[PDB]
Coordinates of N, CA and C and ligand atoms in Angstrom, one line a residue:
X1 N 0.8 -1.2 0.0 CA 0.0 0.0 0.0 C 0.9 1.2 0.0
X2 N 0.4 2.3 -0.6 CA 1.1 3.6 -0.7 C 0.0 4.7 -1.0
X3 N 0.3 6.0 -1.0 CA -0.6 7.0 -1.2 C -1.4 6.9 -2.5
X4 N -0.6 6.5 -3.5 CA -1.3 6.4 -4.9 C -2.3 5.3 -4.9
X5 N -2.0 4.1 -4.5 CA -2.9 3.0 -4.4 C -4.1 3.3 -3.5
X6 N -3.8 4.0 -2.4 CA -4.9 4.4 -1.4 C -5.9 5.4 -2.1
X7 N -5.4 6.4 -2.8 CA -6.3 7.3 -3.5 C -7.0 6.6 -4.7
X8 N -6.3 5.7 -5.4 CA -7.0 5.0 -6.4 C -8.2 4.3 -5.9
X9 N -8.0 3.7 -4.7 CA -9.2 2.9 -4.0 C -10.3 3.9 -3.7
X10 N -9.9 5.0 -3.1 CA -10.9 6.0 -2.6 C -11.6 6.7 -3.7
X11 N -10.9 7.1 -4.8 CA -11.4 7.9 -5.9 C -11.9 7.2 -7.1
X12 N -11.3 6.0 -7.4 CA -11.5 5.3 -8.6 C -10.8 5.9 -9.8
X13 N -10.9 5.2 -11.0 CA -10.4 5.7 -12.2 C -11.5 5.9 -13.2
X14 N -12.0 7.2 -13.4 CA -13.1 7.5 -14.3 C -12.5 8.2 -15.5
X15 N -12.9 7.8 -16.7 CA -12.5 8.4 -17.9 C -13.5 9.3 -18.5
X16 N -14.6 9.5 -17.8 CA -15.7 10.3 -18.3 C -16.1 11.4 -17.2
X17 N -16.5 12.6 -17.6 CA -16.9 13.6 -16.7 C -18.0 13.2 -15.9
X18 N -17.8 13.1 -14.6 CA -18.9 12.7 -13.6 C -19.0 13.7 -12.5
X19 N -20.2 13.7 -11.7 CA -20.3 14.5 -10.5 C -19.8 13.6 -9.4
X20 N -18.9 14.1 -8.6 CA -18.4 13.2 -7.5 C -19.3 13.2 -6.3
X21 N -18.9 12.5 -5.2 CA -19.7 12.4 -4.0 C -20.0 13.7 -3.2
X22 N -19.2 14.8 -3.6 CA -19.5 16.1 -3.1 C -20.3 17.0 -4.1
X23 N -20.6 16.4 -5.2 CA -21.5 17.0 -6.3 C -20.7 17.8 -7.3
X24 N -19.4 17.7 -7.4 CA -18.6 18.5 -8.3 C -18.1 17.8 -9.5
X25 N -18.1 18.6 -10.7 CA -17.6 18.1 -12.0 C -16.2 17.6 -11.8
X26 N -15.9 16.4 -12.2 CA -14.7 15.6 -11.9 C -14.2 14.6 -13.0
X27 N -12.9 14.2 -13.0 CA -12.5 13.2 -14.0 C -11.2 12.5 -13.5
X28 N -10.9 11.4 -14.2 CA -9.6 10.6 -13.9 C -9.7 10.0 -12.5
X29 N -8.7 10.3 -11.7 CA -8.6 9.8 -10.3 C -8.9 11.0 -9.4
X30 N -10.2 11.3 -9.2 CA -10.5 12.4 -8.3 C -10.0 13.8 -8.6
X31 N -9.8 14.1 -9.9 CA -9.4 15.4 -10.3 C -10.5 16.3 -10.4
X32 N -10.6 17.3 -9.4 CA -11.6 18.3 -9.4 C -11.5 19.3 -10.5
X33 N -12.4 19.4 -11.5 CA -12.4 20.3 -12.6 C -12.7 21.8 -12.2
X34 N -13.8 21.9 -11.5 CA -14.3 23.3 -11.1 C -15.3 23.2 -10.0
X35 N -15.3 24.3 -9.1 CA -16.4 24.5 -8.1 C -17.6 25.3 -8.7
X36 N -17.5 25.6 -10.0 CA -18.6 26.2 -10.7 C -19.7 25.2 -11.1
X37 N -21.0 25.6 -11.1 CA -22.1 24.7 -11.4 C -22.2 24.4 -13.0
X38 N -21.5 25.0 -13.8 CA -21.6 24.9 -15.3 C -20.8 23.7 -15.8
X39 N -21.5 23.0 -16.8 CA -20.8 21.9 -17.4 C -19.7 22.3 -18.5
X40 N -20.0 23.4 -19.2 CA -19.1 24.0 -20.1 C -17.7 24.2 -19.5
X41 N -17.7 24.8 -18.3 CA -16.6 25.1 -17.5 C -15.8 23.8 -17.3
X42 N -16.5 22.7 -16.9 CA -15.9 21.4 -16.7 C -15.1 21.0 -18.0
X43 N -15.7 21.1 -19.1 CA -15.1 20.7 -20.4 C -13.9 21.6 -20.8
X44 N -14.1 22.9 -20.5 CA -13.0 23.9 -20.9 C -11.9 23.7 -19.9
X45 N -12.2 23.5 -18.6 CA -11.2 23.1 -17.6 C -10.4 21.8 -17.9
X46 N -11.1 20.8 -18.3 CA -10.5 19.5 -18.8 C -9.5 19.8 -20.0
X47 N -9.9 20.5 -21.0 CA -9.0 20.8 -22.2 C -7.8 21.6 -21.7
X48 N -8.0 22.6 -20.9 CA -7.0 23.4 -20.2 C -6.0 22.4 -19.4
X49 N -6.5 21.5 -18.7 CA -5.6 20.6 -17.8 C -4.8 19.7 -18.6
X50 N -5.3 19.2 -19.8 CA -4.7 18.1 -20.6 C -3.8 18.7 -21.7
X51 N -4.2 19.8 -22.2 CA -3.5 20.5 -23.3 C -3.9 20.0 -24.7
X52 N -5.1 19.6 -24.8 CA -5.7 19.2 -26.1 C -7.3 19.2 -26.0
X53 N -8.0 19.1 -27.1 CA -9.4 19.1 -27.1 C -10.0 17.7 -26.9
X54 N -10.6 17.5 -25.7 CA -10.7 16.2 -25.2 C -11.7 15.0 -25.7
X55 N -13.0 15.1 -26.0 CA -14.0 16.1 -25.7 C -14.7 15.6 -24.4
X56 N -14.2 15.9 -23.3 CA -14.7 15.4 -22.0 C -14.4 13.9 -21.7
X57 N -13.5 13.3 -22.5 CA -12.9 12.0 -22.3 C -11.4 12.1 -22.4
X58 N -10.7 11.2 -21.5 CA -9.2 11.2 -21.5 C -8.7 9.7 -21.5
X59 N -7.4 9.6 -21.8 CA -6.7 8.2 -21.7 C -6.3 7.9 -20.3
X60 N -6.0 6.6 -20.0 CA -5.5 6.2 -18.7 C -4.2 6.9 -18.5
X61 N -3.4 7.0 -19.6 CA -2.1 7.7 -19.5 C -2.2 9.1 -19.0
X62 N -3.2 9.8 -19.6 CA -3.5 11.2 -19.2 C -4.1 11.3 -17.8
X63 N -4.9 10.4 -17.3 CA -5.4 10.4 -15.9 C -4.3 10.1 -15.0
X64 N -3.4 9.2 -15.3 CA -2.2 9.0 -14.4 C -1.3 10.2 -14.3
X65 N -1.2 11.0 -15.4 CA -0.4 12.2 -15.4 C -1.1 13.3 -14.5
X66 N -2.4 13.5 -14.6 CA -3.1 14.4 -13.7 C -3.0 14.0 -12.3
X67 N -3.2 12.7 -12.0 CA -3.1 12.1 -10.7 C -1.8 12.4 -10.1
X68 N -0.6 12.2 -10.7 CA 0.7 12.6 -10.2 C 0.8 14.1 -9.9
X69 N 0.3 14.9 -10.8 CA 0.3 16.3 -10.6 C -0.5 16.6 -9.4
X70 N -1.7 16.0 -9.2 CA -2.6 16.3 -8.1 C -2.0 15.9 -6.7
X71 N -1.4 14.7 -6.7 CA -0.8 14.3 -5.4 C 0.3 15.2 -5.1
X72 N 1.2 15.6 -6.1 CA 2.3 16.5 -5.9 C 1.7 17.9 -5.4
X73 N 0.6 18.3 -5.9 CA 0.0 19.6 -5.5 C -0.5 19.5 -4.0
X74 N -1.1 18.3 -3.6 CA -1.6 18.2 -2.2 C -0.4 18.3 -1.3
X75 N 0.7 17.6 -1.6 CA 1.9 17.6 -0.7 C 2.4 19.1 -0.6
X76 N 2.6 19.7 -1.7 CA 3.1 21.1 -1.7 C 2.1 22.0 -1.0
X77 N 0.8 21.8 -1.1 CA -0.2 22.6 -0.4 C -0.1 22.5 1.1
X78 N 0.2 21.3 1.6 CA 0.4 21.1 3.0 C 1.7 21.8 3.4
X79 N 2.7 21.6 2.7 CA 4.0 22.2 3.2 C 4.1 23.7 3.1
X80 N 3.2 24.3 2.3 CA 3.2 25.7 2.1 C 2.2 26.4 3.0
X81 N 1.4 25.6 3.8 CA 0.4 26.2 4.6 C 0.9 26.1 6.1
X82 N 1.0 27.3 6.7 CA 1.6 27.5 8.0 C 0.8 26.7 9.1
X83 N -0.5 26.5 9.0 CA -1.2 25.7 9.9 C -1.0 24.2 9.7
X84 N -0.9 23.8 8.5 CA -0.8 22.3 8.2 C 0.6 21.8 8.4
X85 N 1.6 22.5 8.0 CA 2.9 21.9 7.9 C 3.5 21.4 9.2
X86 N 3.4 22.2 10.4 CA 3.9 21.6 11.6 C 3.1 20.4 12.1
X87 N 1.8 20.4 11.8 CA 1.0 19.3 12.2 C 1.4 18.0 11.4
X88 N 1.4 18.2 10.1 CA 1.8 17.1 9.2 C 3.2 16.6 9.6
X89 N 4.2 17.4 9.9 CA 5.5 16.9 10.1 C 5.6 16.2 11.5
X90 N 4.7 16.5 12.4 CA 4.6 15.8 13.7 C 4.1 14.3 13.5
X91 N 3.4 14.0 12.4 CA 2.9 12.7 12.1 C 3.9 11.7 11.7
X92 N 3.6 10.4 12.0 CA 4.3 9.2 11.6 C 3.9 9.0 10.1
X93 N 4.7 8.2 9.4 CA 4.6 8.0 8.0 C 3.2 7.6 7.5
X94 N 2.5 6.7 8.1 CA 1.2 6.3 7.6 C 0.1 7.4 7.8
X95 N 0.1 8.0 9.1 CA -0.7 9.2 9.2 C -0.4 10.3 8.2
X96 N 0.8 10.5 7.8 CA 1.1 11.5 6.8 C 0.4 11.1 5.5
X97 N 0.3 9.9 5.1 CA -0.5 9.5 3.9 C -2.0 9.8 4.1
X98 N -2.6 9.6 5.3 CA -4.0 10.0 5.5 C -4.1 11.5 5.3
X99 N -3.1 12.3 5.8 CA -3.1 13.8 5.7 C -3.1 14.2 4.2
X100 N -2.2 13.6 3.4 CA -2.2 13.9 1.9 C -3.5 13.5 1.3
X101 N -4.1 12.4 1.6 CA -5.4 12.0 1.1 C -6.5 13.0 1.4
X102 N -6.6 13.4 2.7 CA -7.6 14.4 3.1 C -7.5 15.7 2.4
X103 N -6.2 16.1 2.1 CA -6.1 17.4 1.4 C -6.4 17.2 -0.1
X104 N -6.0 16.1 -0.6 CA -6.3 15.7 -2.1 C -7.8 15.8 -2.3
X105 N -8.6 15.2 -1.3 CA -10.1 15.2 -1.4 C -10.7 16.5 -1.2
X106 N -10.3 17.3 -0.1 CA -11.1 18.4 0.4 C -10.5 19.7 0.1
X107 N -9.2 19.7 -0.3 CA -8.4 20.9 -0.5 C -7.8 21.5 0.8
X108 N -6.7 22.2 0.6 CA -6.0 22.8 1.7 C -6.9 23.7 2.6
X109 N -7.7 24.6 2.0 CA -8.5 25.6 2.8 C -9.4 24.8 3.8
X110 N -10.2 23.9 3.2 CA -11.1 23.1 4.0 C -10.4 22.4 5.1
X111 N -9.3 21.7 4.8 CA -8.6 20.9 5.8 C -8.1 21.8 6.9
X112 N -7.5 23.0 6.5 CA -6.9 23.9 7.5 C -7.9 24.6 8.4
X113 N -9.2 24.4 8.0 CA -10.3 25.0 8.8 C -10.7 24.2 10.0
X114 N -10.2 23.0 10.1 CA -10.5 22.1 11.2 C -9.4 22.3 12.3
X115 N -9.5 23.5 13.0 CA -8.5 23.9 13.9 C -8.3 23.0 15.1
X116 N -9.4 22.5 15.6 CA -9.4 21.6 16.7 C -8.8 20.2 16.3
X117 N -9.2 19.7 15.1 CA -8.6 18.5 14.6 C -7.1 18.6 14.5
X118 N -6.6 19.7 14.0 CA -5.1 19.9 13.9 C -4.4 19.9 15.2
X119 N -5.0 20.6 16.2 CA -4.4 20.6 17.5 C -4.3 19.2 18.1
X120 N -5.4 18.4 18.0 CA -5.5 17.1 18.5 C -4.5 16.1 17.8
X121 N -4.5 16.1 16.5 CA -3.4 15.4 15.8 C -2.0 15.7 16.3
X122 N -1.8 17.0 16.4 CA -0.4 17.4 16.8 C 0.0 16.9 18.2
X123 N -1.0 16.8 19.1 CA -0.8 16.3 20.4 C -1.0 14.8 20.5
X124 N -1.2 14.1 19.4 CA -1.4 12.7 19.3 C -2.7 12.2 20.0
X125 N -3.7 13.0 20.0 CA -5.0 12.6 20.6 C -5.8 12.0 19.4
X126 N -5.4 10.8 19.0 CA -6.0 10.2 17.8 C -7.5 10.0 17.8
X127 N -8.0 9.4 18.9 CA -9.5 9.2 19.0 C -10.3 10.5 18.9
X128 N -9.9 11.5 19.6 CA -10.5 12.8 19.6 C -10.5 13.4 18.2
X129 N -9.3 13.3 17.5 CA -9.1 13.8 16.2 C -10.1 13.1 15.2
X130 N -10.2 11.8 15.3 CA -11.1 11.0 14.5 C -12.5 11.3 14.8
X131 N -12.9 11.6 16.0 CA -14.2 11.9 16.4 C -14.6 13.2 15.7
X132 N -13.7 14.2 15.8 CA -14.0 15.5 15.3 C -14.0 15.6 13.8
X133 N -13.2 14.7 13.1 CA -13.2 14.7 11.6 C -14.5 14.1 11.0
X134 N -15.1 13.2 11.7 CA -16.3 12.6 11.3 C -17.5 13.7 11.4
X135 N -17.3 14.8 12.0 CA -18.3 15.9 12.1 C -18.0 16.9 10.9
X136 N -18.1 16.4 9.7 CA -17.8 17.1 8.5 C -18.8 16.8 7.4
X137 N -19.0 17.7 6.5 CA -19.8 17.4 5.3 C -19.2 16.3 4.5
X138 N -17.9 16.3 4.4 CA -17.1 15.3 3.7 C -17.4 13.9 4.2
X139 N -17.5 13.7 5.5 CA -17.8 12.4 6.1 C -19.2 11.9 5.8
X140 N -20.2 12.8 5.8 CA -21.6 12.4 5.5 C -21.9 12.1 4.0
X141 N -21.2 12.8 3.1 CA -21.4 12.7 1.6 C -20.5 11.7 0.9
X142 N -19.3 11.5 1.3 CA -18.4 10.4 0.8 C -18.0 9.5 2.0
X143 N -19.0 8.8 2.6 CA -18.8 8.1 3.8 C -17.8 6.9 3.7
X144 N -17.8 6.1 2.7 CA -16.8 5.0 2.7 C -15.3 5.4 2.4
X145 N -15.2 6.4 1.5 CA -13.9 7.1 1.1 C -13.5 8.3 2.0
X146 N -14.2 8.4 3.1 CA -13.8 9.3 4.3 C -13.6 8.4 5.5
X147 N -14.4 7.4 5.8 CA -14.3 6.5 7.0 C -12.9 5.9 6.9
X148 N -12.4 5.5 5.8 CA -11.1 4.8 5.7 C -9.9 5.8 6.1
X149 N -10.0 7.0 5.6 CA -9.0 8.0 5.9 C -9.1 8.3 7.4
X150 N -10.3 8.5 8.0 CA -10.4 8.8 9.4 C -9.8 7.7 10.2
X151 N -10.2 6.4 9.8 CA -9.7 5.2 10.6 C -8.2 5.2 10.6
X152 N -7.6 5.7 9.5 CA -6.2 5.6 9.3 C -5.5 6.6 10.3
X153 N -6.1 7.8 10.4 CA -5.7 8.8 11.4 C -5.8 8.2 12.8
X154 N -6.8 7.3 13.0 CA -7.0 6.7 14.3 C -5.9 5.7 14.6
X155 N -5.6 4.9 13.6 CA -4.8 3.6 13.9 C -3.3 3.8 13.6
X156 N -3.0 4.6 12.6 CA -1.6 4.8 12.2 C -1.2 3.5 11.4
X157 N -2.1 2.7 10.9 CA -1.8 1.5 10.0 C -2.5 1.5 8.7
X158 N -2.1 0.6 7.8 CA -2.8 0.5 6.5 C -4.0 -0.4 6.4
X159 N -4.5 -0.8 7.6 CA -5.5 -1.9 7.7 C -6.8 -1.6 7.0
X160 N -7.2 -0.3 6.9 CA -8.5 0.0 6.4 C -8.4 -0.1 4.8
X161 N -7.3 -0.3 4.3 CA -7.1 -0.4 2.8 C -6.8 -1.8 2.4
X162 N -6.8 -2.7 3.4 CA -6.4 -4.1 3.2 C -7.6 -4.9 2.7
Ligands
LIG201 CA1 6.7 13.6 3.8
LIG202 CL1 7.0 6.8 11.1
LIG203 CL1 -18.0 6.5 -1.0

């Protein structure tokens, strides 16, 4: 198991423009196209992201490319955010992967907004952190692909992906 295989499990590999479990226009392996309600935007965002005229469909090679870019962006997002970086760096290796996953799904701003969760994770209060993370829109709308991430913060093992 690793962060890539973890996110492939949580996000799947879709080659067609779909609305994800949070209701957003999406493609590949959990690549968020736009927070706009417009479908045109999704398509013009996809062409922008790929560098060719798609038409709302991509290759597995292209999905894997966006996916690497997106994992790379989640890690850089954490490291450049003053609230997340020290909490992240306090974490053991497996919890760090749950952290990357959470940001990949929800984005930096959303994740950094869980002030209490951050403090608890930093102090290694794993149960409290997990309890507080489950009190999110994310948890209610993508329950199976949120429960595994939260359980991972609780246990510090890969068992939920086994
Ligand atoms: Ca690291
Ligand atoms: Cl470790
Ligand atoms: Cl789900």
